[PDB]
Design a binder for this molecule. Structure first.
Ligand SMILES: C[C@H](O)c1nccn1Cc1cc(-c2ccc(C#CCCCO)cc2)on1
Ligand SMILES: [Zn+2]
Length: 295
């Protein structure tokens, strides 16, 4: 069967929140079958746990934020992207502050740290959400859609009105999450960055954790990791936002100028429309439409 995964060993890391600029200590731990991914604010007494589920998304402006009452965990989407990309069903993610550390802007450090710890298969079938009807949501010129598909693929199309320019598709039948998506970094434009800082956001961002663009060019000395890094990062973000379904997808996602907001809107419409999806397991990995790398 395709089995659930958790972590073999604990992972720790120390970083800064992209928006908050606060130092934060992260610890990922193993969790039992059917736990899902659960964030814990361990700086608080008592500790405040928030499952990484679409129902818990509180704000979607320039990151995806989980909220339970007054308590938040901001910027979950890169780490969630990594966990999704590696097949991780169950994990606790402890944080000593309100925002997941940004690392280098991408999921590369998370996938490295995870894979250095190692994964552990669990004796229970992995549950997938299978798209059985097209579900779309739109708002103005922005669109996000789920289409039935026997596998998992993601397409994205951004319309940026800027000299540094995009679209891309990835199908995990041939694309490596790790090699081709995980390294794509967080990005931003000088006009927004100042506005965001004036709105007291973006406080931790720098050329160390993001592509910084002026009116013409990428200012980072070392340039890009992929020719299409920006759009590959949008795919990264979307995989992370979609993992808030709390199970891997069998289907296709297509995003057209979509962001965290519309991505969450799509999850919510999907979840509400039970005719459009069903949960499935695969007792024989050999006949399934997807595969995972070795644990
Ligand atoms: C997080 C989300 O998933 C996300 N992924 C890609 C983009 N975004 C939104 C976003 C980008 C930034 C950002 C903030 C500050 C700087 C910077 C800088 C240095 C300026 C000093 O000259 C660069 C970028 O903030 N939010
Ligand atoms: Zn991002």
């Amino acid at each position: 069967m395709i089995k659930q995964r958790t972590l073999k060993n604990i992972i720790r890391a120390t970083g800064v929140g992209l928006h908050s600029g606060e130092k934060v200590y992260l610890t990922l731990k193993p969790a039992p079958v059917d736990t899902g991914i659960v964030f814990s604010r361990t700086d608080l007494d008592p500790v405040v746990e928030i499952p990484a589920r679409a129902e818990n998304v509180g704000e979607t402006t320039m990151s995806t934020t989980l909220v339970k009452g007054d308590v938040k965990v901001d910027t979950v989407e890169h780490l969630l992207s990594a966990m999704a990309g590696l097949g991780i069903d169950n994990a606790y993610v402890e944080l000593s502050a309100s925002e997941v550390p940004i690392m280098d802007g991408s999921a590369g450090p998370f996938v490295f740290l995870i894979q250095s710890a190692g994964l552990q298969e669990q004796e229970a079938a992995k549950k997938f959400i299978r798209i059985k009807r097209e579900v779309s949501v739109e708002e103005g010129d922005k669109r996000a859609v789920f289409v039935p598909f026997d596998g998992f693929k993601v397409s994205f199309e951004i319309d940026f009105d800027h000299p540094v320019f995009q679209q891309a598709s990835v199908d995990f039948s041939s694309t490596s999450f790790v090699k081709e998506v995980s390294r794509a970094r967080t990005f931003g434009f000088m006009r927004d960055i100042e506005y965001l800082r004036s709105q007291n956001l973006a406080l931790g961002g720098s050329v160390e954790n993001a592509i910084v663009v002026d009116e013409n060019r990428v200012l980072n000395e070392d340039g890009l990791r992929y020719e299409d890094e920006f759009v590959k990062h949008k795919i990264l973000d979307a995989i992370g936002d979609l993992y808030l379904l709390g199970n891997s997808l069998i289907g296709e996602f297509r995003g057209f100028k979509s962001g965290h907001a519309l991505n969450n809107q799509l999850l919510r419409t999907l979840i509400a429309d039970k005719d459009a999806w069903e949960v499935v397991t695969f007792e024989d990995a050999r006949t399934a439409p997807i595969s995972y790398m070795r644990p």
